[model samples]
Target: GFLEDAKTDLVLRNYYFNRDFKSLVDEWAQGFILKFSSGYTPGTVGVGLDAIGLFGVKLNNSELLPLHAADNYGRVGVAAKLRVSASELKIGEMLPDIPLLRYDDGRLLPQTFRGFAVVSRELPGLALQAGRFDAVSLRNSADMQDLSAWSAPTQKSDGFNYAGAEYRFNRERTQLGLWHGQLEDVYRQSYANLLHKQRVGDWTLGANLGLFVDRDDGAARAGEIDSHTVYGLFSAGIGLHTFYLGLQKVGGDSGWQSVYGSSGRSMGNDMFNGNFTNADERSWQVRYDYDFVGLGWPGLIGMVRYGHGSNATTKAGSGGKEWERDVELGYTVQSGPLARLNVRLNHASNRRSFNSDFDQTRLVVSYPLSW
Candidate 1:
């Protein structure tokens, strides 16, 4: 019965990324990702399983893969799941997508963590989750390694812990989130978030606000640290166009912190290159997106954005400034033998007063198969 309900998918991705600073850096790779999900067995307690197979072959060289002359890298991840009465527990390697400990899948392959996680939704409109991860499989490596903070990569930790709760109200148009995380003895952080959306005639407006408080923890292996981050993103949409405004600030001696190989998608103004979370930095962004369905193209989309950060505490000075501009275009095949095939192009230019400047471009093509 479980086999009858199981689902499997294989996705092939072709990726190319290039950046020019004083020197040129680039990567071209082919990636294969196979996923298998099994339906739970019938019982008071249900048991299921999930698995992922990731493999990549390098066509060129860069940071996306190991720089040590490796021609290929691959890894397999599996998780066992147990479910009971609206609650579930998973153990083993997983790619978590939570706000506090998200995995990075922006490259050829996604990172994964060895951990135990639990999610509960026993109460209506409320969800709770908690997890502890002890090891990580990096994006560019085939082996699992110890965990580390993104800010202090040399200082290793035993692992990390995270817990979060979210509640939705007001006809599901409003949501509140509370999250806490600890990176062993390195640091502790708490986050609060609020999100809302409103509809007025032909336009819809939305707001997302967040606050973070952080401090040194336990043994303080990464040294003393204190920081606060606040951010707000507002948006409006009408017809085929959407517009966005983002504001963010970082205070105290330390910059925003995240786990190595994790994505800081929770932060406002996060972009393809950087999130502008330097110490004492203040940043703002404007973005626009368009859907091509209104123009008779069902699966075409385009986006453009600009962001600037100032007052950053850099090696050169405290008045450092940086700006970035990005553009993206994507399309998906609607039907035929290439149905669901997708292609995307991304370009970005970044300039900084105190740091290195770069221009970057990326091209990605994806094809999926299911039976």
Candidate 2:
């Protein structure tokens, strides 16, 4: 019965990206994923298991830009997830994040590694999570390796430990979170976050507040430094469009310290390659999104965003100014033999006071089937 109740999912994707500052370069990649889930059988405390199989291939790549050739590299791994009551424990080869060993997702498919994680939601409106990661695979490379920072290329440390908790209030409209993570001999990081949402007349308003503090510890070979970041994002939706404003400030002797090659998703305004984070950096963003369904096209969507960062202090430069503009369009097939198929296009331009200017684009398509 359990075998018959299992579910399977398959996904395929194609992506292209380019950076003008580096040179004329192009990357093409495709991916396939198969996910299986087993429903808990009838029992006092039911037991369930889940697994996912992933595969990728490089369809086209060029060395003119170097990083583009890293796309569509393939790896195979498996995850075993155990579920009971309102809690779950996942172990084996999977995504791992222990502050210091956080996974990197800079490329097509995110990196995966070995680890164990426990998540529980037995208490209403409250969730708990704890995990430990051993290794990490970066987004631009196929090999799994130890965790490092995006700013530091020559340093590698082991044993990144992490834990976090989150609570939701008011029917999931408001949430607060606290997290702590560390990479041995390098630095330790702590984060706090709050999010709130409200509806006013015909408009919806949302706010996000976040902070990160980092300090040196352990061997102290990297020297001693401290950094702090404060960020806020506010957004409102009216009619078919949503507008956003973001503000962020960074303070400390050292730049915002983080593991090398890790995505800044944990930060408030982390964009492609953590473009908005640096020591003593201040940044802001304006973004807009629209749904075409409100205008009669039920399956189409569009979005645009622009960001600017300044006051950066690094060995590379000072008083640096950087800006990025991103545009995206997407559609899903709603009927016929290919119903539910989805496609998307993304384009972006980035320029900085010290670094080279660049532009990139990506295209993705996928389909899902279920019973």
Candidate 3:
């Protein structure tokens, strides 16, 4: 009974990153991620457990500046889960995914939080979720600590409460989402999203749009906050190529608000260097992607995109502008002894006068095995 419904896997990754501003810093590391979980035991109320081990080792010089101040480290997370009817409850360490908050796994290890979470799908075509997190372990940190506003280093938020719902209609081609999030005494924010796709003449058109509103909350620790942000990403695809155009506008006196260690949400102008989410900012982007599968390459792809932002009103004044150019190429082995192995290369050139201008490259090779 113990081994009948268990799942386990080991992932090995070699990562290299280089960032050049005024000076340059290069980092290299290997990461080992072990995951294990079990199906719930049979009962009216079933119980299960999930565990993850994140380990990293330095592969080269370890004095990287933006690093977590450690060369080799590891952490283990365990979660207890319960299933009843079409709903589930989980406690302890978990990586959450919601419109307003989601974990970031862009580095060697994933960011995680300790919390209580509940999910339900009792209604057809609808889903619901709620949670309250007490602590967070950042992607680069070894210790779990209090949360903070993403861009404000001096402000701390000890409590993160959130809930969200999503419903799909019209054969699941369209969906709507609403969510709210609070960072204790710092800020409160809400999000609404819409997504849809349609097909016509050998091409598919899609739209994804979101709007966010934020305000000061509780003791007003990070005082006097008000903002509204809306963005849209429209896509058209045919054959091997896809084209995308998007626009984003930040209104009010502040930028979009989210906690540290989570994604920047679905804002269209987000990039490797910045989210283009400053006070009273406006940004737009155009992107293109190509797949090599039709050309006898089963798992190769390439992408290039550019974004420009202007009219940003920072603390200093207006007329702040920036631009970035980014490119990516990646491939996965489809059929071979090393099948399912993947290699990816990414590069970006970011230019700005207000902040450090930099060129960056990130390369990763991953081999995942299951048992």
Q: Which model scores highest in lDDT?
A: 1
The CA-based lDDT of model 3 is what?
A: 0.85
Clash count, predicted structure 3 = 0
lDDT of 2: 0.73
| Candidate 1 Cα deviation (angstroms), residue 145 | 1.0
Clashes of each: 0, 7, 0
Per-residue CA lDDT of model 3 for 1-371, tens digit only, reads 33578889899988898988848878888888889887897888989998889888876723221254466877899999899899999998988877777787787877888998999999999989999998988876667888888757568888899999999978889999999989999899999999999888999899999999999889877878999999998999999999999899999988788888777745766776667888888899999999989888889999999999888887767878989999999999987899989999999999874677889999999999987
User: In TM-score terms, which candidate is top?
Assistant: 1
Model 2 lDDT per residue over 1-371, tens place = 35667887776655565655537666666666666777766655556666656566776633211254543455566666667778888776776553334566445566666667888999998988887666765554556677655555566777567788889988789999888887777778888889999998999999999888888768743568698888899999998889998999999987777766665666667665455778889999888899999889988999888888999987787898888888989999878999899888888888877777778877777777764
- List CA RMSD, all candidates: 1.2, 3.0, 1.9
Candidate 3 lands at a TM-score of 0.96
lDDT, residue 195, candidate 1: 98
Query: What is the TM-score ranking, best to worst?
Result: 1, 3, 2
